Amino acid sequence: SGAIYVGNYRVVNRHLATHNDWANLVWEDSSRDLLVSSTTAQGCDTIARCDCQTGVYYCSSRRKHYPVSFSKPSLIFVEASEYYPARYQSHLMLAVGHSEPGDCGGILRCQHGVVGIVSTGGNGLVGFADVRDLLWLDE
């Protein structure tokens, strides 16, 4: 679990969004596994606006933050799960690292701020849904 809180927006994995997130929907994209809902109070996370490919992510299944190198956002095949059929997920970045399904939502950060959240894994990898192209999160 986990979210990004920037301005009056809450960014979560779409597959973990609540019925209340859908009522307060701003934007969602199944192909990116992202959902943004509106909030009453202002959030304090800063979104990174950069092309960093190294950062640190939070792994709840280890209670540990790990430094990682990660690929640029791409269209990657993701195996079927209880949340989606087998499909390509877009704006996805992969790294070598530990992840379990409950780790989705953990933040990936660089020196500029929040880059994205954990969204995929399997086979000794961890994948992150990029949010750096969502410029409207800032206004």
Ligand SMILES: CSc1ccccc1C(=O)N1CCC[C@H](C(N)=O)C1
């Ligand atoms: C850290 S997610 C994970 C972890 C271990 C094994 C598999 C996964 C994983 O790739 N999944 C499961 C949850 C939904 C994901 C999605 N965004 O389609 C796909």
Ligand SMILES: [Zn+2]
């Ligand atoms: Zn950066």
